[PDB]
Amino acid sequence: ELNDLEKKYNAHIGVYALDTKSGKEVKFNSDKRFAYASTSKAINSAILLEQVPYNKLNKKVHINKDDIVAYSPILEKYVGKDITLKALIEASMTYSDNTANNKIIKEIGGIKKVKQRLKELGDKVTNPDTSTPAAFGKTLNKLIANGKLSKENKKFLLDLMLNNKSGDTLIKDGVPKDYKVADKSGQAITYASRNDVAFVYPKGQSEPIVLVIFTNKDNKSDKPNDKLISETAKSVMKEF
Amino acid sequence: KELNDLEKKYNAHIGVYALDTKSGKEVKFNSDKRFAYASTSKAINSAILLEQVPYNKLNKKVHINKDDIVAYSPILEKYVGKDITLKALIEASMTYSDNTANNKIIKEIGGIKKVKQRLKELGDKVTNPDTSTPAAFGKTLNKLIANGKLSKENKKFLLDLMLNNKSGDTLIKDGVPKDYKVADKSGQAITYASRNDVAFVYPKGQSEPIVLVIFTNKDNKSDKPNDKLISETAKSVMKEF
Numbered sequence A: 001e002l003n004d005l006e007k008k009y010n011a012h013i014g015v016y017a018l019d020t021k022s023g024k025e026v027k028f029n030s031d032k033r034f035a036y037a038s039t040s041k042a043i044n045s046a047i048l049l050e051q052v053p054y055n056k057l058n059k060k061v062h063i064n065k066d067d068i069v070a071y072s073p074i075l076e077k078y079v080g081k082d083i084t085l086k087a088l089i090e091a092s093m094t095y096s097d098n099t100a101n102n103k104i105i106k107e108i109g110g111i112k113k114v115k116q117r118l119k120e121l122g123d124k125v126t127n128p129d130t131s132t133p134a135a136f137g138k139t140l141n142k143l144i145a146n147g148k149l150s151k152e153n154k155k156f157l158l159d160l161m162l163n164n165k166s167g168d169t170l171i172k173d174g175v176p177k178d179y180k181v182a183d184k185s186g187q188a189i190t191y192a193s194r195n196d197v198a199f200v201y202p203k204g205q206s207e208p209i210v211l212v213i214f215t216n217k218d219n220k221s222d223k224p225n226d227k228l229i230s231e232t233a234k235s236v237m238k239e240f
Numbered sequence B: 001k002e003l004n005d006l007e008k009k010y011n012a013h014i015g016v017y018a019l020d021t022k023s024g025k026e027v028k029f030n031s032d033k034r035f036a037y038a039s040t041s042k043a044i045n046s047a048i049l050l051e052q053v054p055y056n057k058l059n060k061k062v063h064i065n066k067d068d069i070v071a072y073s074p075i076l077e078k079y080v081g082k083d084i085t086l087k088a089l090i091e092a093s094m095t096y097s098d099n100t101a102n103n104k105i106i107k108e109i110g111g112i113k114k115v116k117q118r119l120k121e122l123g124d125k126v127t128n129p130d131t132s133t134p135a136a137f138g139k140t141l142n143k144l145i146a147n148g149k150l151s152k153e154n155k156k157f158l159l160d161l162m163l164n165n166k167s168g169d170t171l172i173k174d175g176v177p178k179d180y181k182v183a184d185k186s187g188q189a190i191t192y193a194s195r196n197d198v199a200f201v202y203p204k205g206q207s208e209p210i211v212l213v214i215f216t217n218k219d220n221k222s223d224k225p226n227d228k229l230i231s232e233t234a235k236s237v238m239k240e241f
């Protein structure tokens, strides 16, 4: 199980899983801080979807040269063009586009308005760099799984997660055939697979198990442990 | 135990130097042997910058571009096209062992040539950017951080990071007594089996620390490192104080 997986891999593992149907929790270093990478992009996209209706997603934003930052694969092709908010959220959620994320936060009212929304949600732990498995899972439940998003803005966002290929070797490989997973992978720039979060849907249950899995090796940037994350998922899934 | 025997038990090479800065008492075992180190040197570089920047001035910001980014930069990869302060680069280098934060701290000092010159000046003529010895690295952390020139502010800012470091848990912090306070920085090579820990151990009742340096590598480099070795080395060495 989980401390044997610390030994097995020589990694640290932080888990927080929450069945929202029953209130049941699985923890393990839940109150320890990890650097979570692009999984914050799922938060920033849902807070803008709280304020913009699905029909108003056809608003264009103008992209100019100074707006573009490194590791933007879609938005580097938009210097001096306009793009809808919808296509900014697909680029940030499918490609982890950095320019798309910056424009989505600009559009929320700057990072202070994101910080403040989290204080309102009751998360005094998450900051743009690090959070704990526990803080993050609760924020994800309150904002996406049991939040205030319209039927249509929440199907839009979950289908981007449901149809994402990035972490089919992480929580997705780890659960049984018949569970459906909607995940936001870490897809970190400078080091290999380390984080993954998901909404796991039991076959015959509409409510999700929220599952946060943050891991740390330290200093080995090209070794992914896709299998430390799918093993940790398997063992967690027993509890439900 | 004996240290000779832990090498025998875990099939490892151990280098260790301990100095009680209160009495002046040293423990040595493979002291003058050279080991290639990595992230334990981030605490040396953090201490040379805090020697020329007053704590109130740590809010100064540097701009990050794509070309500063290097591999395993857990925190700074989220800052391309952004500024970050100097108190924040040091916390990312010390807490998360971020490599863009370390390189930017070295550039602030004035580069590797001024890190060299500073060591030379502290009397360390052994350490180079590649290897060092347990004895050289131990006298250098003592002369820069425990009996150095840092302000009170900056010496507690730096040790609080090392004290609340969750990546050194399975190493020195795990082998000492229950009421020994341990402030450390870990390190481990990428390409072969190697595991290091340097620390400032505070025995109950004394405010002077023991400086502990433990360098280790498995005799078969293809072997997975075992954190237990550092833990058990630390336990033996502490019995000598």
Ligand SMILES: [Cl-]
Binding pocket: A036, A037, A038, A185, A186, A187, A188, A192, A193, A194, A195
């Ligand atoms: Cl990641």
